[PDB]
């Protein structure tokens, strides 16, 4: 409900190195059911933050392994699916949606100085496909634009 | 003497009453839901209590027929129950006569004549009730099947009668768009959700009546409280 | 208008008026309660006598139309009568045909039928009456329906019809009747009557009680006289204190 | 093309019912032992304004016999009280065609 | 009801049904050198409907058949009547009804039933084909219960101008079964969306008999054939 | 011609429609469609919108019984 959740996700983010996927595959739904919640607008978007800054830390995890690609079309296919199995449109659009957006592209940002060809031309698309109908969409909306020209 | 009194044509033949026997259907404020499943079919109906001192179990929409089929009404109760009876008469006639149980369509088309005969003649009220019936028949699966007082009927793989008709069949038909091998849990789950959003009122389970007839078990039943609450909460997270 | 003198023809809404015409008539005549105890069902009615030249019973709307089966009437007493007539012949009929006592559900499901056939029609008019049926059997329990003239029969706890009948059945949902026996049953109905009774808008009056249950054996009678005259005894104490 | 968008607006539902009754159920004094789903629940059909007429007319029983508070009661019955004033209504839902 | 004469000797009753039958679904029947066709178009209102559930055409026999312009429950019962009478007429006779006859019989039930008072008189109208002696026969009843015979005609919804595009077609020497192609193009003329697997309904009569036709040859006459 | 339609959104199935719809309501429908896609955010609408944007306005169910058709 508050952010004490985000400290059990501290311990959520102890052990789920140790072992794989399907430990953070399981603390996936407590975070859908903290997204889920959505108290006061942006009250509920502190966890909604934490939960993305747990699956980009599990997506550095990922990346330093061989498991990029899988978690990237996971992480997407989880953030395209939000609108339905939370609130809809991630429950807000802005400022737990746009905290996601940057936290993602400056995934893109860590990636694109480490990663080869194959990670990045498929990060690259699943970004692509959500900048083609939503991202950030305030005022700058220029992630996008930067993150294409790394693209070409 | 204008036929605006007494079942007769019009310019253009409009008669007048059995529109008025609709509207009269639609006075009572309830609503039922039917669905048809791959071997499943399932009637939703709410109610409303006014208060405590009446016996909720004596009020009931949902009859058993017969073994195997189960029948459900809307609009005025005593008319309703009357030709439940007459149903149940037909029924057990044709049991009496003929020696098996009567596909759902022959109680349809028997009771859809009655209904004509009503509106045919003067002197005679044409009937205030709509009614649904779902069965299971050998080699076809289940059956759900409509009757108004005017005597028409169809086949429907799904359907719905009740005050918020149109909205209810636009959900319908938008979800058996995307048909694709309906299941009973799947198909009680959908129709709870299609009421739910019809009526907007996130019902509590003691205020529904669902009856299901399936393939596996073709003896038609009527649901508890307990299956009731269980699918409520299968389908509350979703 | 044209379309409002016949039981047959309709309103261009959907509904009748000369039921609705009958629903007036009924709740034009006085009050009459059903209650549903833990073991049976009792009747209590207040009659108002018109001059003190009855010679005192007469025209008692309660009536035995079966030996385990009493019954309450409001409206107009000589559709009542025939309708008393008619419950007891169809006992009859199914006591001869079956072999035993008939369930009081499916009476008043023959019964509903009865009053909704004459509805059907413009030969016929509506009935002026609404009649509750109560009884009791170790087989079943205790049971109790109201019948309006329209044909809804409906089972209650506890069930009131008349010009009262709002007050009546608000101070039937404060008690707990599910809980009480019979001797406080008889206790809680008088009181309300009493309440109910209103006094100034009316003569004179008279109480009737009816009993059915296992403390009677199931055959439904009249209540005793010396479990009456207490009814009065026990208002006076409970009659507010200005 | 002239008038863009229609707007209805229903009889209030059981919760609209009780939000509505909670917003006039401001200005109260009274012992709270009042549940409020009772009045929902014998409400139905009921307008958006006749619930404020309730509570006004709940009132109008604390204000004689001397009762500065409002006894839990009161409110039934005032929803009886509203409903034969109702029941002369002539229920037209006037569809825009 | 017991209506009668007006002061211009005319019936408004049955004006008013035919008035109403004119308004009902659009429907035609042709008479070939080998058979008849007849055909009619079901809008179906949404998805939810069954198609093969209510069918439009009927078998009274194995060379017998009807279609209407109308009401329905009325349709359905005065099939009940046909199917029942043309059976006492086998049971007496012991051999197949033909065609005209069940026509004046049909007709006379019409006669009494505008006739006798307190019932309100039908409002459908009913399109009969069959096989007897070789000779194809087609005929028209309207409710009053006059009975018209037609090699070609159309009933229903914008019923004149079909008659006139049959007028214009219509050699009535068409020995083959193409006259179905040219029912199929009255129908397309005031078919509403598309001609589709199920929205028309299409029955024969040939020497071998009246048979309903499988929506798969609907189908297939819907391809190709317009 | 001046919306987004981005890759699929189909229009001829909605020709097919019966019940005679009028010509300025079309309008109505294109613009009450951007509303909707306003609302949630995007700047491209997408087909997801059109259905529930046109059962939004017709909204003429069948005014009609279909015994006596």
């Given amino acids: ?152 | 003497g204008f036929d605006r009194h007494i079942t007769i044509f019009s310019p253009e033949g409009r008669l007048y009453q059995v529109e008025y026997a609709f509207k009269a259907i639609n006075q009572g404020g309830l609503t039922s839901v039917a669905v048809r499943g791959k071997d499943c079919a399932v009637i939703v109906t709410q109610k409303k209590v006014p208060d405590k001192l009446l016996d909720s179990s004596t009020v009931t929409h949902l009859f058993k027929i017969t073994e195997n089929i189960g029948c459900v009404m809307t609009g005025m109760t005593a008319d309703s129950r009357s030709q439940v009876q007459r149903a149940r008469y037909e029924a057990a006639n044709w049991k009496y006569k003929y020696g098996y149980e009567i596909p759902v369509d022959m109680l349809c088309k028997r009771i859809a004549d009655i209904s004509q005969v009503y509106t045919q003649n003067a002197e005679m009220r044409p009937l205030g009730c709509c009614m649904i019936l779902i069965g299971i028949d050998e080699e076809q699966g289940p059956q759900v099947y409509k009757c108004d007082p005017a005597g028409y009927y169809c086949g429907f793989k799904a359907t719905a009668a009740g005050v918020k008709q149109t909205e209810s069949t636009s959900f319908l038909e938008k979800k058996v768009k995307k048909k694709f091998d309906w299941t009973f849990e799947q198909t009680v789950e959908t129709a709870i959700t299609c009421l739910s959003t019809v009526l907007s009122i996130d019902f509590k389970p003691s205020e529904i009546e669902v009856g299901v007839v399936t393939v596996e078990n073709p003896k038609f039943r009527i649901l508890t409280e307990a299956e009731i609450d269980a699918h409520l909460v299968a389908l509350a997270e979703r | 208008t044209g379309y409002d003198l016949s039981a047959s023809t309709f309103s261009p809404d959907g509904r009748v008026f000369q039921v609705e015409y009958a629903m007036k008539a009924v709740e034009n005549s006085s009050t009459a309660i059903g209650i549903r105890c833990k073991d049976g069902v009792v009747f209590g009615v207040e009659k108002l006598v018109l001059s003190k030249l009855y010679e005192e019973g007469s025209n008692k709307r309660l009536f035995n139309v079966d030996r385990h089966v009493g019954m309450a009437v409001a409206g107009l007493l000589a559709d009542a009568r025939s309708l008393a007539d008619i419950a007891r012949e169809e006992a009859s009929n199914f006591r001869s045909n079956f072999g035993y006592n008939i369930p009081l559900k499916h009476l008043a499901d023959r019964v509903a039928m009865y009053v909704h056939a004459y509805t059907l029609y413009s030969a016929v008019r509506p009935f002026g009456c609404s009649f509750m049926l109560g009884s009791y059997s170790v087989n079943d329990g205790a049971q109790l329906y109201m019948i309006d003239p329209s044909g809804v029969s409906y089972g209650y706890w506890g069930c009131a019809i008349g010009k009262a009948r709002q007050a009546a059945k608000t101070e039937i949902e404060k008690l707990q009747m599910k809980e009480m026996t019979c001797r406080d049953i008889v206790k809680e109905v008088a009181k309300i009557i009493y309440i109910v009774h209103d006094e100034v808008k009316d003569k004179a009056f008279e109480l009737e009680l009816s009993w059915v249950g296992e403390l009677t054996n199931g055959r439904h009678e009249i209540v005793p006289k010396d479990i009456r005259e207490e009814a009065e005894k026990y208002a006076k104490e409970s009659l507010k204190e200005e | 093309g002239r008038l863009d968008r229609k707007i209805h607006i229903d009889l209030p539902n059981e919760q609209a019912r009780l939000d509505i009754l909670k917003i006039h159920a401001g200005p109260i004094t009274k012992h709270g032992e009042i549940d409020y789903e009772a009045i929902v629940k014998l409400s139905d059909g009921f307008n958006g304004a006749d619930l404020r007429n309730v509570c006004t007319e709940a009132g109008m029983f604390a204000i004689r016999a001397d009762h500065d508070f409002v006894v839990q009661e009161d409110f039934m019955k005032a929803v009886r009280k509203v409903a034969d004033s109702k029941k002369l209504e002539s229920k037209l839902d006037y569809k825009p065609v | 009801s017991l209506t009668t004469f007006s002061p211009s000797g005319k019936l408004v009753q049955i004006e008013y049904a035919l008035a109403a039958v004119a308004g009902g679904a659009p429907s035609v029947g042709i008479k070939a050198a080998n058979g008849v066709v007849l055909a009619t178009e079901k809008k179906q209102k949404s998805i939810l409907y069954d198609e093969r559930s209510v069918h439009k055409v009927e078998p009274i026999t194995k060379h017998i058949g009807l279609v209407y312009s109308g009401m329905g429950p009325d349709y359905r019962v005065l099939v009940h009547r046909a199917r029942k009478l043309a059976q006492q007429y086998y049971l007496v006779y012991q051999e197949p009804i033909p065609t005209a006859q069940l026509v004046q019989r049909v007709a006379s039930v019409m006669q009494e039933y505008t006739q006798s008072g307190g019932v309100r008189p039908f409002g459908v109208s009913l399109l009969i084909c069959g096989w007897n002696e070789g000779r194809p026969y087609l005929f028209q009843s309207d409710p009053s219960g006059a009975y018209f015979a037609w090699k070609a005609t159309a009933m229903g919804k914008n019923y004149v101008n079909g008659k006139t595009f049959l007028e214009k077609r219509y050699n009535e020497d068409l020995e083959l079964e193409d006259a179905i192609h040219t029912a199929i193009l009255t129908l397309k003329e005031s078919f509403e969306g598309q001609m589709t697997e199920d929205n028309i309904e299409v029955g024969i009569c040939n020497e071998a008999g009246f048979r309903r036709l499988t929506p798969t040859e609907v189908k297939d006459y819907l391809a190709a054939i317009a | 011609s001046k919306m987004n339609l981005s890759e699929e959104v189909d229009l001829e199935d909605y020709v097919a429609r019966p019940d005679k719809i009028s010509g300025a309501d079309i309008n109505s429908i294109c613009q009450e469609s951007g509303m909707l896609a306003v609302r949630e955010n995007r700047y491209i609408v997408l087909a997801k919108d059109f259905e529930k944007a046109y059962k939004t306005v017709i909204k003429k169910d069948e005014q009609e019984h279909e015994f006596y058709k």
Avoid: F, H
């Fill in chain 1, 1 to 152: 409900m508050a952010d004490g959740g985000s400290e059990r996700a501290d311990g959520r983010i102890v052990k789920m190195e140790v072992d794989y996927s399907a430990t953070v595959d399981q603390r996936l739904p407590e975070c859908a059911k903290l997204a889920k919640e959505g108290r006061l607008q942006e009250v509920i978007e502190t966890l909604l933050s934490l939960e993305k800054q747990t699956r980009t830390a599990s997506d550095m995890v990922s990346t330093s392994r061989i498991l990029v690609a899988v978690v990237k079309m996971c992480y997407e296919a989880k953030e395209w699916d939000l609108l339905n199995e939370n609130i809809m449109l991630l429950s807000k659009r802005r400022s737990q949606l746009k905290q996601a957006v940057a936290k993602m592209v400056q995934q893109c940002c860590t990636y694109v100085e480490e990663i080869t060809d194959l990670p990045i031309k498929l990060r690259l698309i699943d970004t692509l496909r959500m900048v083609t109908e939503g991202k950030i969409y305030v005022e700058i909306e220029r992630a996008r634009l930067t993150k294409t020209l790394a693209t070409i």
